[PDB]
Amino acid sequence: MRECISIHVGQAGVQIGNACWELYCLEHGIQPDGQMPSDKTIGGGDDSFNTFFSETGAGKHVPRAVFVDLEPTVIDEVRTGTYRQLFHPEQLITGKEDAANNYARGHYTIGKEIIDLVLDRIRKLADQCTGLQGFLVFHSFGGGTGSGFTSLLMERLSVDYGKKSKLEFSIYPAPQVSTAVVEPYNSILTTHTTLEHSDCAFMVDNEAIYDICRRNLDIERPTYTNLNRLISQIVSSITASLRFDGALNVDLTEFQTNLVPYPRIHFPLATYAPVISAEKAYHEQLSVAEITNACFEPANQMVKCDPRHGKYMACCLLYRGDVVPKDVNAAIATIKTKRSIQFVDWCPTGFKVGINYQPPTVVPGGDLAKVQRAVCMLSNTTAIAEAWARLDHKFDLMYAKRAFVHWYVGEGMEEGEFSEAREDMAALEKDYEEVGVD
Amino acid sequence: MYTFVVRDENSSVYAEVSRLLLATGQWKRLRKDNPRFNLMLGERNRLPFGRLGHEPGLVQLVNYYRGADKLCRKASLVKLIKTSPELSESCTWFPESYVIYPTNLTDEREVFLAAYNRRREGREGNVWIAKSSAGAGILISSEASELLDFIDEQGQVHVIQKYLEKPLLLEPGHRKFDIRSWVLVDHLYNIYLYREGVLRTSSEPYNSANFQDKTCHLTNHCIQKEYSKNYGRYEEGNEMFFEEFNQYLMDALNTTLENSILLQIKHIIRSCLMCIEPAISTKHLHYQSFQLFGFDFMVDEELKVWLIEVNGAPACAQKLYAELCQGIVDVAISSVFPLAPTSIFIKLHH
Amino acid sequence: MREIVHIQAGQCGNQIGAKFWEVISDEHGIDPTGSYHGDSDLQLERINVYYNEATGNKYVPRAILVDLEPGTMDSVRSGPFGQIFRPDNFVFGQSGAGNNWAKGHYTEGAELVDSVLDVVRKESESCDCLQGFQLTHSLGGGTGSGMGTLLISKIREEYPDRIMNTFSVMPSPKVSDTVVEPYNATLSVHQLVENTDETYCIDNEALYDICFRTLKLTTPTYGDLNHLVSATMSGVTTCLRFPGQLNADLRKLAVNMVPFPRLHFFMPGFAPLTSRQQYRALTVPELTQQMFDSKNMMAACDPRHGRYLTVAAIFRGRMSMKEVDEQMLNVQNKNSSYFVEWIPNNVKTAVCDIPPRGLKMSATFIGNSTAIQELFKRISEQFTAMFRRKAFLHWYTGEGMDEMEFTEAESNMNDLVSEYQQYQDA
Amino acid sequence: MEVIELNKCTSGQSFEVILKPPSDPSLEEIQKKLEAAEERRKYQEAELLKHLAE
Ligand SMILES: Nc1nc2c(ncn2[C@@H]2O[C@H](COP(=O)(O)OP(=O)(O)OP(=O)(O)O)[C@@H](O)[C@H]2O)c(=O)[nH]1
Ligand SMILES: Nc1ncnc2c1ncn2[C@@H]1O[C@H](COP(=O)(O)OP(=O)(O)CP(=O)(O)O)[C@@H](O)[C@H]1O
Ligand SMILES: Nc1nc2c(ncn2[C@@H]2O[C@H](COP(=O)(O)OP(=O)(O)O)[C@@H](O)[C@H]2O)c(=O)[nH]1
Ligand SMILES: [Ca+2]
Ligand SMILES: [Ca+2]
Ligand SMILES: [Ca+2]
Ligand SMILES: [Mg+2]
Ligand SMILES: [Mg+2]
Ligand SMILES: [Mg+2]
């Protein structure tokens, strides 16, 4: 058994982290007080769930998690929430004034003065690990902390833990629920400095999660609670292989080996199905072919884009519930003869399939209905380059007039870092185009 | 009030649509780089589809189907027909074609010679035409050596196609021609064929013993108006419309345009567009597409219709601009953005 | 706790400030004696932003009252909520400022400024984490204008990394006390250009016209004008006084509203504005259309003469947040020519459940529009009509100023005008 | 359409289907970046105070 440490940075990271550990507990049978009646090895053991939970002598199962925010209001909810008993104070770090949606403020001004404290808290969790695999980092692109401090933390993590893998769950900015105009600046600045330090990153576009909540869950104006419950189901599906017995994606290294042959192109597209409204009285359970076919519907993707006009470098099918390999292969054959699935010539045209017999757990009182089977597809497709294009275009519009640049320079960042970061993105977009288009 | 932007100033078609849209008083033209639009009249090349459908509260529509280039490119069309099962290499309405890359650069050089040598030994007519998309640059010859050598002097992909040596000739004149059909596909993927086509006729007698002079072999409008002496003699602008052509087929062939030619044209249009529908449909997409296509057909002396190519950015006959453009606003734009007949289109069912 | 320190200086600044604390005190359930008697927990969740909590559960406004004569602050101390202010936070002289910027900034004001800073330092030292300052004053007088901008300069020197925010009443010849108001306003504006992060521009002429043309008040008084300012000040500060996501603190608001440091002068707006047909229920469409109507804006600048760099809207009350986005998106998409296209998504909307007193719902508008240059052009033209003849300058040279400082202030504000113009055609 | 590496356990199974074959900055350099930005802030703030002293 090898441990995984989760790090939640900024409001987005912290609130998403709170929803995931809620779901993790329900999935593993861990009560809010930390007790786990099914764990017969009191205060020890190297089971699969031990990768995410340590244990105290009293039998408390404590998440291997750290929460960081430059402002205390969001993390005070964790200290006072249902699962407050889950964590101890060393795990929750809060400053007094935030980054004001200013990458330079989170990275330089405030980050410089708190980075050593955060590393010290992470080191404590690392000292509890007998074979630490690496870290899962949750954060937003748009916020000043999630963008600015995250990139600094990733840089240091690569220094303090050279051989450890690092995966991201990043929230892509969407104006329908965005609070800042400079979020394109922050997104590009944090991708530039984090790109060489992240082995694999799963981007969730708030615009996609938002529309799925209105279309499939019949929520007219979704809240962050709604968005976070859905995101934690996708996150759980991705991390299940690390927390349960299995042979696919059993450690963080396997995520890179199976999804990222080209190091810079490390942003797999996530597609999830089915998402059924709990308020829905009569519901008809979908088959294996129906949920698999849905993985190729743009409307179910974590990032809205058209994979028909890109090339696949890798594809992973993660099933939960009543699914047998016979029905998966039959559905896959049917989809090939009907769908536009083009792999890059230097990659085998295949699918790695994982099946977990336990169906998706639903939070009591949540928005999602219990389903008999569900799937999450992870495909590394060049079609996700559409997201970088949208974001770089907004960047170019503001930066041509130097709009808002003074806020960043005022925090000690050089204006040249803007163009430096932008040119790195232009090279990233070029990499996708060389791998996808003829 | 609906908003639209114009990103192709060279489109005669959508200049009239824009003129009509503003005539309603309910459409407003924004700067070509304003993202808050309902309708985009986009550029021909490198249209940024990836930026459509991401503006909150705006239902956005674009006049191009992403992926339709597969059909409107010489080499692309050939490959699509040979590789797509619903078309198959045995497709009976598309002339035998081969994708040939110049030697200075897969390629179908050997496959072409095999079919060429088979015709040479069989005493059959072995006249082929070499063409590409980067042309205004076409060569017609019966010797495979001249064709391949012509493509090697170039630097772009070409296609060697079997030349229809028995085209239907209009009398009087003994002249070659082609047929242009305008087809509009809306956001729901309904296939509408404009009831008005145009025959682009050659004003020179068809000569089968001299492919060097390509004035009586190429029915392009600019070629007849530049290198032909009898331009406009038989019909104005070498353009014969369905009314006159239908009356001709009845007087000389005792048949109609519908039975002898139109049924094959409607079949070909539907086959090509249904083939790529899964690849380009915008049904469940975050934005909506529609596109006007220009199909080019040849007709031989057996009244068999052949598809020559498909144009993704076609123009229209001067006489048919007002009707067609208005029809574009009715079925393509107003269907999605309604305002506050006897349709001019023939809906091809599927 | 992100505490804000409030300062009000001069006649105008103290009368508008007093009304402001009266309005928000009612919103938070604070009575004239500082005792809380509300019925919602949302009233106290962010109360510490503006109020200190004393013994006995008393809430004391974190406000400092400044003036160079006693008169107005006597009226405050005896007014409705006069007893709610900290007695030690009244700082005042006796000589007055004679509507003279030099007296407020250089002579009379210089003698009193240090004692005012002693109170500011006291209030800041008891803040868990001070956000910044907000100042209410006029630019046409002597104390609020001359001494107010003196205070801002000395506050920025002591707290260089805190946000400085002001509500600045711009003078107008139609609602004028003295003919030197353009002199005082031009001198203050240069101070504001350099030492404030956000300045809400409030034009007395727009307030008058709204009272006369819209509210149908035959003979407006300063009191009538001040009620519009109270309601507007309450609206723009709702994001700071109640739970919310957008513009949560002063610094985040500045980062979303100020794309260039000098162009930080905002046009505020309010809806509804109804005359006494006052019980009719307002619809979200009606709120939105009125909020963006020029007749509902208080800077006397026609937005259709310029372009919005950024916009911050705040909707209050129980309403369809879904229907709010639809009307907002309808306004942007129906008038995109007035929004600069090089700042994507520059219109941000926030909702608040608690409505103002006596209204089921309302909306407050904060625009950073290049049209504001019309306001500085008026002031500049009035300045030059007198300065070209050196009229009334002796009031100022008698306090130690020389003509050069006037010429520089004139050029500084013409530069500002030129800066707005270059972005109106970008 | 081949299935390889089929693994089965009590809580699930996994396999791979193949349809077709194919055809950093040191701790020192980071402190300099952080300190360099801190110096630029200090310089700008000094100019502001110098401006206010005038
Ligand atoms: N999906 C989701 N997105 C969120 C959540 N919270 C914030 N966001 C998004 O994150 C972006 C704002 O960044 P934040 O994470 O809130 O800012 P921060 O990391 O706390 O940094 P600061 O500037 O210091 O506040 C916006 O695009 C929000 O829409 C959340 O709980 N769930
Ligand atoms: N296989 C074939 N047999 C006989 N004639 C042919 C032919 N292919 C093309 N032609 C002739 O060549 C002319 C133009 O061919 P093609 O359409 O490939 O060029 P082009 O694309 O530049 C004209 P357009 O503007 O319609 O696209 C046609 O009018 C037709 O008469
Ligand atoms: N809106 C409003 N404006 C005022 C009020 N009192 C004065 N003014 C304006 O303020 C300017 C005079 O400044 P004033 O505050 O009286 O001078 P000060 O006491 O030296 O700061 C003139 O332009 C007046 O129109 C008031 O109560 N409300
Ligand atoms: Ca155990
Ligand atoms: Ca590394
Ligand atoms: Ca004195
Ligand atoms: Mg935050
Ligand atoms: Mg063509
Ligand atoms: Mg006065």
Nearest-by-CA chain C residue for D45: C160
Q: Which residues, 6+ apart, have CB-to-CB distance to C238 below 8 Å?
A: C244, C314, C316, C350, C352, C364
Q: Are B279 and A308 an interchain contact pair (Cβ–Cβ within 8 Å)?
A: yes
Enter the tokens of residue A367.
Answer: 């928005």
Provide the residue range defining the domain that includes B261: 69-70+168-348
Enter the tokens of residue B209.
Answer: 């013993």
Rounded (10°) angle between helices A111-127 and A150-160: 50
Residue B340 shares a structural domain with residue B226 = yes
CB A52, CB A24: distance < 8 Å = yes
CA A214 to chain centre: 21
Three-class secondary structure of residue A197 per DSSP: helix
Q: Kindly tell me the number of DSSP H helices and DSSP E strands found in chain A.
A: 15, 12
* Mutation for testing the B interface, residue in A211, A220, A300, A304 having most B CBs under 10 Å: A304
Three-class secondary structure of residue A235 per DSSP: helix
* φ/ψ (deg, to 5) at A344: -65, 140
Elucidation method: X-ray
Q: Are C261 and A406 an interchain contact pair (Cβ–Cβ within 8 Å)?
A: yes
Distance A54 CA to ligand 4 centre (A): 8
DSSP C421: H
Q: From the CA of A164, which ligand is nearest?
A: 5
First to last CA, chain C: 41
Domain-ending residue, one of B44, B68, B92: B68
Q: Are A350 and D1 an interchain contact pair (Cβ–Cβ within 8 Å)?
A: no
Residue B178 shares a structural domain with residue B33 = no
Say yes or no: B3 contacts chain C, CB-CB below 8 A: yes
Mutate to test the pocket of ligand 2, among B147, B168, B296, B311 (most ligand atoms within 8 A of CB): B296
Question: Which residues of chain B neighbour C341 with C-beta distances below 8 Å?
Answer: 31, 33-35
Q: Any idea how long chain C is?
A: 426
Residue holding tokens 């219109």?
Answer: C347
Distance CA A395, CA A186 (A): 9
CB atoms within 10 A of CB A230: 26
Atom of ligand 3 nearest to the CA of C100: 20
Element (H, E) at A160: helix A150-160
- Residue A57 class from Cβ within 10 Å (0-12 exposed, 13-18 middle, 19+ buried)? exposed
Distance CA D13, CA D50 (A): 71
Question: What are the catalytic residues of A?
Answer: 254
Distance CA C248, CA A99 (A): 12
Q: Are A175 and C2 an interchain contact pair (Cβ–Cβ within 8 Å)?
A: no
Q: Which residues, 6+ apart, have CB-to-CB distance to B188 below 8 Å?
A: B283, B335
Distance CA C337, CA C335 (A): 5
The full 3-state SS of chain B, as one line of letters, equals: CEEEEECCCCCHHHHHHHHHHHHCCCEEECCCCCCCCCEEECCCCCCCHHHCCCCCCCCCEECCCCCCHHHHCHHHHHHHHHHCCCCCCCCCCCCCEEEECCCCCCCCHHHHHHHHHHHHHCCCCCCEEEECCCCCCCEEECCHHHHHHHHHCCCCCEEEEECCCCECCECCCCEEEEEEEEEEECCCCCEEEECCCEEEEEEEECCCCCCCCCCCCCCCHHHHHHHCCCCCCCCHHHEEEHHHHHHHHHHHHCCCHHHHHHHHHHHHHHHHHHHHHHHHCCCCCCCEECEEEEEEEEEECCCCEEEEEEECCCCCCHHHHHHHHHHHHHHHHCCCCCCCCCCCEEEECC
Q: Do chains D and B touch (3 or more CB pairs under 8 A)?
A: no
Question: Which residues of chain D neighbour C161 with C-beta distances below 8 Å?
Answer: 45
Nearest-by-CA chain A residue for B51: A390
User: What is the DSSP secondary-structure string of A81-136?
Assistant: STTGGGS-GGGEEE-SS--TT-HHIIIIITHHHHHHHHHHHHHHHHHT-SS--EEE
Question: Which residues of chain A neighbour D17 with C-beta distances below 8 Å?
Answer: 328-329, 332, 350-351, 353
Enter the tokens of residue B287.
Answer: 């934005």
Number of domains making up chain B: 2
Distance C144 CA to ligand 9 centre (A): 10
Nearest to A176 among B51, B56, B284 (CB): B56
Answer whether C138 contacts ligand 3 (Cβ < 6 A). yes
Distance B154 CA to ligand 8 centre (A): 18
* φ/ψ (deg, to 5) at C5: -100, 125
Q: Which residues, 6+ apart, have CB-to-CB distance to B254 below 8 Å?
A: none
CB atoms within 10 A of CB C209: 19
Q: Are B57 and C344 an interchain contact pair (Cβ–Cβ within 8 Å)?
A: no
Question: Which residues of chain A neighbour C344 with C-beta distances below 8 Å?
Answer: 175, 181, 184, 394, 397-398
Distance C169 CA to ligand 6 centre (A): 27
Judge whether A206 is annotated as a binding position.
yes
Residue B338 shares a structural domain with residue B193 = yes
Nearest residue to C110 via CA among C88, C132, C125, C95: C95
- Beta strand A312-321 pairing with A349-356: parallel
Q: Any idea how long chain D is?
A: 54
- Residue A12 class from Cβ within 10 Å (0-12 exposed, 13-18 middle, 19+ buried)? buried
CB A376, CB A232: distance < 8 Å = no
Q: Are B35 and C329 an interchain contact pair (Cβ–Cβ within 8 Å)?
A: no
Judge whether A190 is annotated as a binding position.
no
Nearest-by-CA chain A residue for D33: A108
Answer whether C175 contacts ligand 3 (Cβ < 6 A). yes
Q: What is the residue with the minimal CA distance to atom 5 of ligand 1?
A: A12
Question: Which residues of chain A neighbour D19 with C-beta distances below 8 Å?
Answer: 332, 336, 349-351
- The CA–CA distances, whole Å, from B340 to A216, B325, B334 equal 32, 20, 10
- Under an 8 Å CB criterion, which residues of C touch D? 153, 156-157, 160-161
Three-class secondary structure of residue A1 per DSSP: coil
CA dihedral C129, C130, C131, C135 (to 10 degrees): 170
Nearest-by-CA chain C residue for A405: C259
Distance CA C173, CA C283 (A): 36
Nearest-by-CA chain B residue for A298: B285
Question: Which residues of chain A neighbour B53 with C-beta distances below 8 Å?
Answer: 304
CA A290 to chain centre: 25
Nearest to A181 among C251, C256, C325 (CB): C256
Residues with CB under 6 A from ligand 1: A 10-12, 15-16, 69-71, 98-101, 106, 140, 142-146, 171, 173, 177-179, 183, 206, 224, 227-228, 231
CB A199, CB A255: distance < 8 Å = yes
Residue-range domain boundaries for chain A: 1-268, 269-383, 384-438
- The CA–CA distances, whole Å, from A234 to A11, A169, A238, A272 equal 19, 10, 6, 7
Domain-ending residue, one of B68, B102, B118: B68
Residues with CB under 6 A from ligand 2: B 95, 129, 131, 135, 161-164, 178, 218-220, 296, 298, 308-309, 311
* φ/ψ (deg, to 5) at A269: -85, 135
Q: Are C321 and A221 an interchain contact pair (Cβ–Cβ within 8 Å)?
A: yes
- Residue A254 class from Cβ within 10 Å (0-12 exposed, 13-18 middle, 19+ buried)? middle
- Beta strand A312-321 pairing with B2-6: unpaired
Q: Kindly tell me the number of DSSP H helices and DSSP E strands found in chain C.
A: 15, 12
CATH code where residue B25 lies: 3.40.50.11480
CB A426, CB A120: distance < 8 Å = no
Q: Give the environment of ion ligand 9: residues with CB less than 5 A.
A: C 11
Note whether residue B123 is domain-resident: no
Q: Are A325 and D12 an interchain contact pair (Cβ–Cβ within 8 Å)?
A: no
The full 3-state SS of chain D, as one line of letters, equals: CEEEEEEEECCEEEEEEEEECCCCCCHHHHHHHHHHHHHHHHHHHHHHHHHHHC
First to last CA, chain B: 34
- Residue A214 class from Cβ within 10 Å (0-12 exposed, 13-18 middle, 19+ buried)? middle
* Mutation for testing the C interface, residue in B3, B34, B36 having most C CBs under 10 Å: B36
Any bridge partners for residue B100, and if so which? B158
Q: Which residues, 6+ apart, have CB-to-CB distance to C127 below 8 Å?
A: C1, C3, C5
Note if the bond before C220 is cis, omega within 30 degrees.
no
CB C19, CB C230: distance < 8 Å = yes
Q: How far is A430 from chain C (nearest CA, A)?
A: 24
- Residue C267 class from Cβ within 10 Å (0-12 exposed, 13-18 middle, 19+ buried)? buried
CA C280 to chain centre: 29
Nearest to B34 among C326, C330, C336 (CB): C336
Question: Which residues of chain A neighbour C423 with C-beta distances below 8 Å?
Answer: 401
Domain-ending residue, one of B68, B88, B118: B68
Note if the bond before A37 is cis, omega within 30 degrees.
no
Q: How far is B50 from chain A (nearest CA, A)?
A: 5
**Residues making up the binding site of C for Mg(2+):** 69
- The CA–CA distances, whole Å, from B86 to B267, B273, B283, C366 equal 13, 11, 21, 60
Nearest to B51 among A175, A385, A393 (CB): A393
Three-class secondary structure of residue C345 per DSSP: coil
Chain B partners (3+ C-beta pairs within 8 A) = A, C
DSSP C175: B
Atom of ligand 3 nearest to the CA of C15: 27
Distance CA A339, CA A333 (A): 10
Nearest residue to C178 via CA among C219, C142, C136: C142
Distance CA C215, CA C273 (A): 7
